[PDB]
Enzyme design. Structure first.
Site, PDB file in Angstrom:
ATOM      1  N   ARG A  72     -10.448  52.367 -56.846  1.00 50.24           N
ATOM      2  CA  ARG A  72      -9.823  52.770 -55.934  1.00 50.24           C
ATOM      3  C   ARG A  72      -8.677  53.985 -56.317  1.00 50.24           C
ATOM      4  NH1 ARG A  72      -6.140  49.410 -53.066  1.00 50.24           N
ATOM      5  NH2 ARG A  72      -5.850  48.065 -55.145  1.00 50.24           N
ATOM      6  N   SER A 141      -8.759  48.021 -66.005  1.00 55.60           N
ATOM      7  CA  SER A 141      -9.032  46.297 -66.275  1.00 55.60           C
ATOM      8  C   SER A 141      -9.828  46.035 -67.053  1.00 55.60           C
ATOM      9  CB  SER A 141      -9.370  45.771 -64.582  1.00 55.60           C
ATOM     10  OG  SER A 141      -8.190  45.649 -63.745  1.00 55.60           O
ATOM     11  N   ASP A 194      -3.392  44.822 -63.997  1.00 52.17           N
ATOM     12  CA  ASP A 194      -3.098  44.468 -62.740  1.00 52.17           C
ATOM     13  C   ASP A 194      -2.097  43.586 -62.429  1.00 52.17           C
ATOM     14  OD1 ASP A 194      -4.620  42.308 -63.558  1.00 52.17           O
ATOM     15  OD2 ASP A 194      -5.339  42.126 -61.681  1.00 52.17           O
TER      16      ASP A 194
END
Length: 455
Positions: A72, A141, A194
């Protein structure tokens, strides 16, 4: 015949006294990960984030989130303390499967090119005209050796990625050179996990955020730790500020965690079997798999639904945690959605009230054990900071907020309610009123707020 439940009703049971022992073990493994180690299962990584967003930030800031098959791209427009986030939008791009197994420049050229494609579709969004340089926060991540606020070398590709490249090299430099080839003028001001970006986003909104917890697919927690000392970084020589710690607490293990044979069986068949133990008891990726196995024992040695060995009930992953939450919440007097959800995910013709309610009782314990064990970790972090007890006087003016995220907390009401009610019993009536659990919605996404915080 027969009550195979009562064994479950006790191998899962988490009385407050056990929750207190587990939190002390968590506090104890946190001190080991900060030393360190030598074999601590909590890496308790330094994040190099010692300055968090305040709320008085202005201007345009971007963010990239490479989490898995999808990434994203985020842009927000900040307007100071009064208006705060005055604008924000984001697209989401799926990675072609040919790119997750190719070369490194291939994947990062695609990523960087998609970002700059998005960069030139602005508003309404604006920063100082013109030819100022955009700054983005990168949430990556995958395992990383963090060497600075905006740098880190990849340890190993995971979760569906076998790329020839990166891996020892700074994944931030990998993105920079790729962007230049697209050709984008953007500075990467922060490289975040995150969970760190969840705490930063929560801090930007409430100043008392001291930790953040994700109870989603997986589970992780970050928190603000006193610099002197995290002895592996100070306190010789001292610093005297703070430092955000990415705990990686899903790998937490203790002989006090109330495991059962279904947990060991889920571990025996897992793709990492003895790693991420706490995670396989709390997170969403496994809650339904646990209620699935407890149902089988009732479907192969019990039994639950008549005299038959239900169908696809014997398959892994077949009962997702969203599917288990929909059943748990059935408040009908006959459990019709619960029953007419058994008929779907399995299926199974005519489930009865005793079979429907026992199943309502099964979900009632798997979720209760996860939410209660997660409140034991949160309690452990609160202990670590000395925010679990009250002082001489002030009620701890600096109150404590814990920014929560993740679809489990956000979409499983009986889990979140059970979690926040268990943490309140662990803390006392006094100290509970001083600790708030608050939803902090997009961490891997902002990210960008942490970008505003660093130039």
């Amino acid at each position: 015949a027969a009550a195979v439940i009562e064994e479950v009703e006790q191998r899962f049971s988490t009385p407050t006294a056990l929750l207190r022992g587990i939190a002390d073990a968590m506090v104890e493994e946190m001190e080991r990960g900060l030393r360190a180690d030598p074999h601590a299962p909590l890496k308790m990584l330094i994040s190099y984030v010692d300055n968090l967003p305040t709320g008085d930030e202005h201007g345009l800031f971007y963010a990239l989130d490479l989490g898995g098959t999808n990434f994203r791209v985020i842009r927000v427009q900040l307007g100071g303390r009064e208006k705060r986030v005055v604008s924000q939008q984001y697209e989401e791009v799926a990675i072609p499967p040919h790119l997750m197994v190719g070369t490194s420049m291939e994947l990062f050229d695609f990523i960087a090119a998609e970002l700059e494609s998005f960069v030139k579709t602005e508003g309404e969004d604006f920063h100082l005209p013109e030819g100022r340089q955009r700054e983005l926060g990168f949430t990556f991540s995958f395992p990383v050796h963090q060497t600075s606020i905006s740098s880190g070398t990849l340890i190993k590709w995971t979760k569906g990625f076998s790329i020839n490249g990166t891996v020892g090299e700074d994944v931030v430099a990998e993105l920079s050179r790729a962007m230049e080839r697209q050709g984008l003028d953007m500075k990467v001001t922060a490289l975040v996990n995150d969970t760190v970006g969840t705490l930063a986003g929560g801090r930007y909104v409430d100043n008392d955020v001291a930790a953040a917890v994700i109870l989603g697919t997986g589970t992780n927690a970050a928190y603000v730790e006193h610099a002197n000392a995290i002895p592996k970084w100070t306190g010789l020589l001292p610093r005297s500020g703070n430092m955000v710690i990415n705990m990686e607490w899903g790998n937490f293990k203790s002989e006090r965690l109330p495991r059962s044979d279904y947990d060991n069986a889920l571990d025996f068949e897992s793709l990492n079997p003895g790693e991420q133990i706490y995670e396989k008891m709390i997170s969403g990726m496994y809650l339904g798999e646990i209620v699935r196995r407890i149902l089988l024992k009732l479907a192969h040695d019990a039994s639950l639904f008549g005299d038959v060995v239900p169908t696809k009930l014997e398959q892994r992953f077949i009962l997702r945690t969203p599917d288990m939450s929909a059943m748990h919440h059935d408040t009908s007097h006959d459990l019709k959605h619960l029953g007419a959800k058994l008929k779907d995910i399995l299926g199974v013709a005519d489930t009865s009230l005793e079979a429907r309610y026992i199943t309502l009782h099964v979900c009632d314990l798997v979720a209760e054990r996860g939410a209660r064990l997660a409140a034991a970790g949160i309690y452990g972090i609160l202990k670590k900071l000395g925010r679990d007890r009250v002082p001489s006087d002030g009620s701890q003016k600096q109150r404590t907020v814990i920014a929560l995220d993740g679809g489990l907390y956000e979409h499983y009401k009986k889990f979140r309610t059970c979690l926040e009610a268990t943490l309140a019993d662990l803390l006392g009536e006094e100290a509970a009123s001083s600790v708030v659990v608050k939803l902090a919605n997009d961490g891997s996404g902002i990210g960008a707020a942490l970008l505003a915080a660093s130039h």
